[PDB]
Every structure is written in structure tokens, then in C-alpha cells.
Amino acid sequence: RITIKLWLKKDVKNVWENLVQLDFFTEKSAVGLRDNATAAFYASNYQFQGTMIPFDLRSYQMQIILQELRRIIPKSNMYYSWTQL
Amino acid sequence: NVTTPEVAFREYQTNCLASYISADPDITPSNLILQGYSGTGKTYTLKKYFNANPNLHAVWLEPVELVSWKPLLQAIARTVQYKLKTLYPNIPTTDYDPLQVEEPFLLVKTLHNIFVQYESLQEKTCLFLILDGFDSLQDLDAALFNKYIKLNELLPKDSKINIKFIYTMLETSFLQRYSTHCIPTVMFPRYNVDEVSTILVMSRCGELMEDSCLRKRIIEEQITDCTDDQFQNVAANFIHLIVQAFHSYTGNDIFALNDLIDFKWPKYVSRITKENIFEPLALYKSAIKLFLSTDDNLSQTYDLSIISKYLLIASYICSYLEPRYDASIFSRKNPRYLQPSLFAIERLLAIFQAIFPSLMKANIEVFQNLSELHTLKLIATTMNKNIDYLSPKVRWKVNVPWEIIKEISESVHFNISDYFSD
Amino acid sequence: KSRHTMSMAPDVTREEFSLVSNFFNENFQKRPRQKLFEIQKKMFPQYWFELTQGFSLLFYGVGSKRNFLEEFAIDYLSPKIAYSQLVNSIPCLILNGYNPSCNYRDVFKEITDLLVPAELTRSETKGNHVILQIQKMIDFYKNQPLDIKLILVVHNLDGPSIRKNTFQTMLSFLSVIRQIAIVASTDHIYAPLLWDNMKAQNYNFVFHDISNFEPSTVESTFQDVMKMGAEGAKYVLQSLTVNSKKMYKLLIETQMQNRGTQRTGVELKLFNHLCAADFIASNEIALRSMLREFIEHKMANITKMEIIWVPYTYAELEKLLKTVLN
Amino acid sequence: ADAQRSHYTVYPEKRWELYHQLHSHFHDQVDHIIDNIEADLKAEISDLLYSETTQKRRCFNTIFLLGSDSTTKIELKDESSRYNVLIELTPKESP
DNA sequence: AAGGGAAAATAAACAATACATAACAAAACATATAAAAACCA
Numbered sequence: 018r019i020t021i022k023l024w025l026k027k028d029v030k031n032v033w034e035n036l037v038q039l040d041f042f043t044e045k046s047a048v049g050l051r052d053n054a055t056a057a058f059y060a061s062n063y064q065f066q067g068t069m070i071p072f073d074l075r076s077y078q079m080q081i082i083l084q085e086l087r088r089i090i091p092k093s094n095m096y097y098s099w100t101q102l
Numbered sequence: 103n104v105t106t107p108e109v110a111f112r113e114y115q116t117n118c119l120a121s122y123i124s125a126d127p128d129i130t131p132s133n134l135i136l137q138g139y140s141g142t143g144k145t146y147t148l149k150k151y152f153n154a155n156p157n158l159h160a161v162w163l164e165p166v167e168l169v170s171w172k173p174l175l176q177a178i179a180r181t182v183q184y185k186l187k188t189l190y191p192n193i194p195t196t197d198y199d200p201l202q203v204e205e206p207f208l209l210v211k212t213l214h215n216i217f218v219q220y221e222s223l224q225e226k227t228c229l230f231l232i233l234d235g236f237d238s239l240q241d242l243d244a245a246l247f248n249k250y251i252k253l254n255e256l257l258p259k260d261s262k263i264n265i266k267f268i269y270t271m272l273e274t275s276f277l278q279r280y281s282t283h284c285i286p287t288v289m290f291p292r293y294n295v296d297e298v299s300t301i302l303v304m305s306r307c308g309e310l311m312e313d314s315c316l317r318k319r320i321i322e323e324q325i326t327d328c329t330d331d332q333f334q335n336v337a338a339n340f341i342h343l344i345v346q347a348f349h350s351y352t353g354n355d356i357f358a359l360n361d362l363i364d365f366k367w368p369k370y371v372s373r374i375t376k377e378n379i380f381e382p383l384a385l386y387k388s389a390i391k392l393f394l395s396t397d398d399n400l401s402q403t404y405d406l407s408i409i410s411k412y413l414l415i416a417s418y419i420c421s422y423l424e425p426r427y428d429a430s431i432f433s434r435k436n437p438r439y440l441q442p443s444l445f446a447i448e449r450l451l452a453i454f455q456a457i458f459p460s461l462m463k464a465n466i467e468v469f470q471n472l473s474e475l476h477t478l479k480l481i482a483t484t485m486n487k488n489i490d491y492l493s494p495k496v497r498w499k500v501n502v503p504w505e506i507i508k509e510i511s512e513s514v515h516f517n518i519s520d521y522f523s524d
Numbered sequence: 525k526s527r528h529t530m531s532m533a534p535d536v537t538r539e540e541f542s543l544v545s546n547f548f549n550e551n552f553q554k555r556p557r558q559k560l561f562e563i564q565k566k567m568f569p570q571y572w573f574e575l576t577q578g579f580s581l582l583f584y585g586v587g588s589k590r591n592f593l594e595e596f597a598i599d600y601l602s603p604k605i606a607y608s609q610l611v612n613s614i615p616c617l618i619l620n621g622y623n624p625s626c627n628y629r630d631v632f633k634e635i636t637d638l639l640v641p642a643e644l645t646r647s648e649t650k651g652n653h654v655i656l657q658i659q660k661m662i663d664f665y666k667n668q669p670l671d672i673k674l675i676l677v678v679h680n681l682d683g684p685s686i687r688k689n690t691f692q693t694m695l696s697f698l699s700v701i702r703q704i705a706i707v708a709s710t711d712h713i714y715a716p717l718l719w720d721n722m723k724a725q726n727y728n729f730v731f732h733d734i735s736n737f738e739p740s741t742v743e744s745t746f747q748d749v750m751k752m753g754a755e756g757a758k759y760v761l762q763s764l765t766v767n768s769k770k771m772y773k774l775l776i777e778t779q780m781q782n783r784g785t786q787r788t789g790v791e792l793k794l795f796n797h798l799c800a801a802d803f804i805a806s807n808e809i810a811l812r813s814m815l816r817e818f819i820e821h822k823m824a825n826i827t828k829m830e831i832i833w834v835p836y837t838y839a840e841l842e843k844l845l846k847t848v849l850n
Numbered sequence: 851a852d853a854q855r856s857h858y859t860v861y862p863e864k865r866w867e868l869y870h871q872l873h874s875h876f877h878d879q880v881d882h883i884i885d886n887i888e889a890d891l892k893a894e895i896s897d898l899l900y901s902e903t904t905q906k907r908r909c910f911n912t913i914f915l916l917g918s919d920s921t922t923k924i925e926l927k928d929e930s931s932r933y934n935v936l937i938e939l940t941p942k943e944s945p
Numbered sequence: 946a947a948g949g950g951a952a953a954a955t956a957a958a959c960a961a962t963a964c965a966t967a968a969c970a971a972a973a974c975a976t977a978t979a980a981a982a983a984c985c986a
């Protein structure tokens with residue numbers, strides 16, 4: 018529609034790492050914090066399956082929905098046409 | 103009244119931490135939250151306060167070098183009697199066993215034993231404990247953080263020495279679980295693109311002008327007597343450009359900038375000239391090649407044998423090929439993105455016998471390469487890794503992405519993209 | 525879906541099954557079985573010679589091999605090798621893999637006591653030191669005089685405990701030692717799924733077929749099918765009060781008046797009145813308490829009228845009628 | 851009789867000699883080649899584990915041994931006035 | 946060569962089964978101390 022550096026595959030992972038620990042995403046079925054000690058200790062011994070599928074297929078879900086992004090992102094930014102569908 | 107320090111971008115936050123901390127215990131609030139993500143220098147700006155305040159006494163603990171709460175109590179009780187030995191050496195002591203404690207009663211049992219012999223002091227002195235990294239404890243839960251809040255009130259309140267806390271944690275979803283306790287919080291904001299570069303220049307000038315990789319390149323080239331300021335400029339021209347060609351890749355980190363500098367620095371040093379010391383813009387034009395690549399990745403043609411190669415190429419087929427379609431399209435007469443489905447045994451050899459170049463019948467080495475592929479973790483069990491041999495209910499699945507399959511298809515001259523049809 | 529089912533079969537009791545089974549397995553194909561056993565007997569010097577090379581010998585084939593291994597290991601080989609080295613003969617340590625109670629700790633505690641305790645190996649006993657303790661056994665055994673001192677047998681190597689993966693790698697390090705000969709048998713059709721090129725490097729397996737089509741007498745014992753409930757509550761009624769027989773007889777009649785499913789069942793109120801009609805049930809509590817005894821041994825079901833129905837088939841209840849109730 | 855109890859122990863050539871002079875003689879050539887690669891693998895780790903003096907000196911040295919069979923044993927130098935210990939972590943001991 | 950028409954494919958609603966993990970139990974692995982029991986002496 019017009020000069021923007023499209024990045025590779027091998028680098029977005031480094032950006033994808035901070036996004037999940039900025040809690041903008043969640044894992045699909047992940048009980049976050051156990052209530053007491055012995056319920057957490059029962060979750061530590063349990064070997065998991067989501068790590069056994071690779072990094073690029075852990076089914077990440079959403080914390081902040083699309084429609085709310087339009088209200089916070091200003092219209093001066095170029096991606097404002099992408100907030101709405 | 104306290105002697106505040108001064109730092110670069112914590113001008114509001116130095117005031118509040120000078121506000122919420124005094125040497126007097128009565129003015130000192132009990133519990134405190136320093137919150138922010140990694141990449142704000144909270145461990146920096148806290149100790150930077152403490153070096154400017156030699157009047158108070160700080161005991162520094164580190165939860166991240168511990169693993170659990172049961173040593174964490176042993177971490178606390180060992181250190182306070184260690185500290186109070188080095189603060190009041192005239193006071194005699196029945197030294198207790200810090201190995202003895204393992205339960206949250208036993209701490210306040212022992213702190214009832216510790217502080218009573220120290221009752222003869224002259225004024226109410228406070229004593230600040232510091233926990234650094236409370237969210238990344240690797241056995242945390244809901245009912246640990248409140249367990250450490252009320253520890254002050256179980257202590258006798260009239261003792262000459264009062265223990266108070268400061269908690270360092272991150273992941274602010276965690277703090278939203280405990281806002282109803284209303285303990286005073288000092289949040290630490292993230293950074294902006296200028297103040298990342300502004301922090302980074304005043305912290306990395308002390309090494310990158312004094313590195314021998316510069317100092318070699320000084321005497322290796324015809325050294326004009328360039329000043330330290332001339333060394334300061336090229337260092338500053340380096341930092342003001344490296345954050346400009348990489349900020350979108352790294353975000354507002356500081357740690358991820360502190361090492362990418364130390365990877366691209368000597369490769370930048372070799373591409374300087376004697377003349378480009380005065381010529382910075384053309385120097386970037388000569389050293390361009392590193393500024394558009396990441397250089398953090400230290401695509402294999404895989405080691406496995408030929409029959410094991412076709413063993414892999416049949417296992418990728420049941421990422422899309424369901425049993426309703428496969429036996430029709432593979433007669434002897436799109437989920438490329440999606441997560442892979444679940445195998446069973448002998449559906450492999452159902453597809454393996456078909457796609458192999460009657461030419462083969464012995465399957466001893468074919469059974470060899472299966473558990474060879476199981477040790478490579480390229481095809482793994484759905485269940486635990488124990489009973490998968492004897493055919494009970496065991497489902498199998500690949501763990502290799504599409505591209506490594508695509509190269510290994512052509513590596514054995516086999517065509518796979520025909521049989522994937524949306 | 526009109527399917528013929530194992531419930532609709534002429535069933536056979538305990539003593540009737542096992543005796544006529546014992547008749548076949550000792551008289552069906554007796555002459556050709558020892559006729560096979562004499563044919564394979566000439567292979568026995570060939571096994572003796574290869575086994576000096578420390579080769580882990582593995583026997584596959586259809587049928588049970590348990591009798592054949594115990595003849596080949598005990599009587600033939602173990603005194604033959606002791607005579608050929610020059611006194612008690614070579615110790616045989618079998619491992620019953622069909623027995624699921626085999627662990628890794630207990631059998632290896634036998635092994636280090638079967639092998640030489642020349643040093644204080646209990647000092648290295650510390651917390652999994654099993655691979656640690658056998659590693660100190662291996663490198664010492666690399667510089668010893670080459671002679672077999674032990675032959676071990678592992679029957680049914682695909683057994684329920686031996687096929688566990690931490691036990692399998694334990695046997696892998698044993699096989700690289702030259703002093704011990706490893707003669708084992710498996711029965712699974714997916715037995716070579718158990719080993720990669722790492723373990724077979726430690727194993728150097730060779731293979732031989734033995735197919736005598738044996739009945740596996742001992743190996744059938746731990747296994748079970750529906751021969752081994754309609755048969756469960758068949759014995760409890762033989763020891764109860766005499767009134768429970770009658771109140772089950774009145775139960776079984778109108779529950780078979782109409783497979784034995786829910787729909788043929790009876791309501792609780794009328795059945796109370798029916799068992800009040802023959803001067804049997806006083807009230808609901810005296811009915812239900814000796815009906816909880818039929819409930820506690822899962823001899824009757826209830827679903828919703830308030831329908832109590834027997835979960836046995838149409839054919840089974842008339843068998844329960846004419847035999848045990850009458 | 852006893853077969854349901856698990857693991858009960860019990861205590862019950864002109865041609866071939868010309869094989870015997872050939873077999874072991876071959877096997878002396880085998881294992882001497884086996885210790886050659888055993889001395890090879892033990893050497894190339896040992897020099898490379900040392901003499902690597904980096905400038906930052908706040909980083910561990912890592913070594914990726916590609917293609918290795920997960921059984922490669924290592925010896926260490928004595929290197930007095932400092933103890934040098936070896937720790938092995940199995941994936942069985944990684945819960 | 947045309948064409949019938951049965952095999953194969955698609956879709957959709959519904960039922961039945963498998964799967965991932967939570968919660969826990971139990972056995973192996975580990976230490977501690979007062980009471981018994983040998984045991985020199």
C-alpha cells in the first residue's frame with residue numbers, strides 16, 4: 018500500500034519469550050498457582066506433555082482481547098487499521 | 103530525616119524509598135513491595151541506596167540461590183545471628199542451630215530465643231531484611247507470601263531490635279492476588295528507548311574504552327594520539343547506533359543489551375581503520391554486515407540411516423492423513439500448521455511397507471531404529487516413558503517441524519508434498 | 525446389534541476346566557514334541573562354543589520355552605562348562621520374568637552377592653547408586669582372567685516387570701562383562717522394539733528359533749480372563765441364611781417373568797408386599813437390611829417405578845434357579 | 851513347583867585349537883584400537899577444558915559434544931591446591 | 946465410446962471413549978535416639 022524490515026523466524030522467538038512472561042499470553046491449560054504446599058508438591062513430580070511438544074506449538078491463549086486494543090492504541094500508529102479487523 | 107542518594111531515572115522512586123525507610127522502627131512500615139519486571143535495576147537502585155546509608159544495617163538474602171522455603175527459613179536464622187555478632191560483639195550469646203529449623207513455627211520459636219539476650223541495648227534499633235526475587239522461587243504457591251507477612255506480629259513487639267522486611271518480586275499478576283492486604287507498594291516502571299540508551303552509555307564506557315581489544319587495535323593501527331574523549335566518541339557512536347539497529351528485536355531490556363554488545367564489539371573493532379576514527383558515518387557503512395544480523399544462533403542434515411530415514415518419513419504422514427483416507431490413496435493395487443495427531447503401533451509398518459522401494463521383508467533393523475528414534479525424542483510416547491513396549495494402550499506422535507521433514511524427504515529423493523492436499 | 529456374546533456360552537467350572545486342559549497338554553501332540561526335542565538336541569554343542577565368546581544368547585519363537593531353557597541351562601550347560609575349565613558347578617540364577625514382582629534392587633542385591641565381594645562394595649552403597657556400583661564392577665572386570673563364573677537365565681524378557689525401562693538398561697550393562705553368560709527368552713511379537721543400537725551394542729544379541737508349541741502351564745497362572753459377578757455370587761448363596769434363598773427365589777421369579785436387563789425388574793413397594801405375602805418380609809427395614817447383603821456382594825442392581833433388577837443374563841438366572849436355589 | 855517364586859538360584863578338538871590361536875590374536879588388534887579412540891576422546895576434551903582464558907571471566911565454559919553416544923567417560927587433571935570433581939546427572943535423576 | 950451405478954467422499958448431529966493432569970498413596974531411601982543386648986574387664 019506504499020520499507021519496513023520484516024524479520025526472520027529465528028528471532029521472533031526472542032521477542033516471543035518476553036511476551037509470555039509479560040503475561041500477555043497464557044498457556045492453554047495451566048493452573049498457575051497452587052493454594053498450599055502439598056498441592057504444589059503434587060504438581061512438581063508430574064512430568065508434563067506441553068514441553069514434550071516443541072516451542073512453536075505450545076497452544077498459547079490470550080490475556081488481552083483484540084477489541085480492547087483499539088481503545089488503547091492511538092490512531093497515530095500505523096497498525097491502528099489492524100486493531101479493528 | 104535520611105541522606106538520600108541520587109541516580110539516573112529513579113528521581114521519584116528514590117524519594118519514596120527514602121520516605122518508607124528510616125532508621126527509627128516506629129516510622130518504618132512493616133512490610134514493603136518493590137515491584138517491577140526484570141530490566142529495571144531494582145537490585146541496582148536498592149543497593150545504591152544502601153551504600154549511601156551506612157547508618158542503617160542491611161542483611162541481604164537471595165531466594166533465587168535457594169530452592170525452597172524449608173532452607174529459606176534456615177537462610178534467615180543463620181544470618182541474623184551472623185549479623186548481630188558483627189554488630190554487637192560484646193553481647194554474649196547462646197548460639198542456636200540454624201540447621202534445626204524446618205517449619206514456620208520454628209523460626210519465631212528461635213527468634214524468640216535469639217532476641218531476648220539482645221534486650222540490653224540502648225535504643226530501639228531496626229534491622230532490614232531483604233529478599234530478592236520472591237516470584238521466581240521454584241516451589242512457590244498462594245499460601246507462602248502471606249505466611250511471611252505476619253511474621254512480624256508473632257514477634258514480641260517490645261524488643262529492642264525489630265525485624266522488618268522488604269520484598270522484591272516480579273510478574274505483577276502475582277501482586278494482584280494480595281492487594282487486599284494493602285501493604286505499601288513502590289512500582290518500578292519499564293524504560294523508554296532513550297533512557298535505555300542513556301543508562302547503557304554511562305554503564306558501559308568503563309569497560310569498552312579499557313578493553314584490550316581496543317588497546318590492541320590502538321597499537322596495531324598507526325596510532326594517532328586520539329584522546330580518551332576520542333575513544334569516548336566512538337564508544338558513544340557505537341552505543342547510539344547499536345540500540346538504534348536492534349531496539350525492535352530486543353524490547354526495553356538491559357540484560358539483553360549488555361551481552362549483544364559483548365558479542366558484536368570485537369567484530370566491530372576489526373573493521374575500523376586508522377582514518378575512520380574521525381569518520382564515524384562511513385565506518386558504519388564499512389562495518390554494516392553485523393548490524394543487520396542477530397548472531398545469537400550458534401539446520402542439520404540428520405545423522406540417521408536410510409531405513410530410519412523412511413521410518414521418519416512415514417511418521418510425519420499421520421499429522422494429516424486420517425485412517426478414513428489413507429488406505430484408499432496408498433493402494434498396492436491445512437494441518438501442516440496444526441498440532442500432530444496420535445499414532446498407534448503397526449500403522450507405521452502399514453505405511454512403511456507401502457512407501458519403501460516385496461523388496462524388503464526383514465523387520466529386525468526396522469524395529470531397531472524405532473527406539474533409536476525414541477532416544478532422539480523425535481517420536482515420543484503420549485503416556486509416561488515406562489511401559490510403552492508391550493502393546494498396552496500407547497499412542498505415539500512426532501515432534502519434528504515440517505522443514506526438517508522437507509529437507510530429509512529430498513535427502514532420500516522421496517516426494518512428500520504430493521500427499522499433503524488441503 | 526444382535527451379537528453372540530461370551531455370556532451366551534455353555535460355561536465350565538473350575539475343576540472341569542483345568543483337568544481336561546491337563547489331559548490335552550500332556551497327551552495331544554506328545555510323540556512329535558519329543559521328536560522335535562531330540563532334533564534340536566544336536567544344537568547344544570554349538571551353543572556351548574559360541575557362549576565362550578560372551579554372546580548374549582536370545583531365544584525367540586512361538587510357544588512356551590520355559591521347559592526347554594531349564595533343561596538347556598541346568599542339566600546340559602552348567603556342569604559341562606565346569607568340566608571343560610579343569611568343586612561345585614557354575615551357579616545358575618534364573619529370573620522369572622512372568623512373575624511381576626521382580627524389582628531392580630532385589631535382584632541386583634543377589635547379583636553382587638552372587639558375584640565376588642572382594643572389596644567393600646557396601647561403602648559405595650549409598651540415592652540411586654546401582655549404575656554407580658555396577659560401573660565400578662565393570663572396569664575391574666576388564667582386567668580379570670577370562671572365564672565364566674555365572675550363567676543367568678531370564679525367562680519371558682518381555683514380562684510385566686522386566687520390560688520396564690530402568691530395569692532393561694540395568695541388564696544392558698551386565699551383558700558387556702565377559703565373565704557372565706546371558707541366556708534369555710522372550711515371547712512378544714514386538715520384542716525388538718525394546719532395544720536400540722545403544723543397548724544391542726552392550727548386548728551383542730544373537731537369535732535362534734525354538735517353536736515347540738508348548739501350553740505355558742506356569743505362564744497361564746498369573747494371566748486371567750472372565751473365567752478367573754455371575755460366577756462370583758454363585759458361591760455366596762451356598763453359605764447364608766435359608767430365608768435369603770427364598771427371598772431371592774421370589775426375587776428371581778418375577779425378575780425373569782418378563783438377557784436380564786433393567787426392564788424385567790420389580791418395584792420396591794410391591795416386592796415388599798410380595799415378600800410380605802409369603803410371611804417373609806416384616807417391613808421395609810427388615811427387607812432392605814438382608815437386601816443390603818445382596819447389595820454388598822454386588823448380587824443385584826437398582827435403577828429408575830423403583831426397579832431392582834439382577835445384572836445376570838436370561839440364561840444365567842434359570843441356571844441359578846434349577847441348580848443352587850433348587 | 852517353585853517357578854512362581856521369582857529368581858531362585860540353584861547350584862546343580864584338533865580343529866578348535868587352531869581357532870584359538872587366531873581369535874585372541876585378532877582381538878589384541880581390536881581392543882588396542884579401542885583404547886586408541888579412548889585415549890583420543892580423553893585427550894581432546896582435556897586440553898580444551900583448560901587454557902581458555904576469556905576476558906570477561908564471569909561466564910562458564912560450555913562444550914557441546916555432538917554425535918556422542920551418552921556414555922563418553924572423562925578423566926580429570928589433578929591440578930593441586932584445587933579439587934576438581936565430576937558430577938553426572940541422568941535424565942532419570944531429573945524430576 | 947457411453948453410461949449405469951455402486952464405491953468413495955462429505956457433512957452434521959450425537960454418543961462413546963481416550964487423554965492430561967490433579968490428588969494421593971505407598972514403597973524405596975534415609976536418619977535419630979532410647980532401650981536392649983552383647984561384651985570386655
Ligand SMILES: Nc1ncnc2c1ncn2[C@@H]1O[C@H](COP(=O)(O)OP(=O)(O)OP(O)(O)=S)[C@@H](O)[C@H]1O
Pocket residue numbers: 109110111112139140141142143144145146147301305356357
Ligand atoms: N539509574 C540507573 N543508573 C545506572 N545503571 C542502572 C540504572 N538503572 C538500572 N541500571 C542498570 O540496570 C542493571 C539491571 O540490574 P537488575 O537489578 O538485575 O535488573 P532487574 O530489573 O533488577 O532484574 P532482576 O535482577 O531479575 S530483579 C543494573 O545492573 C544496572 O547496571
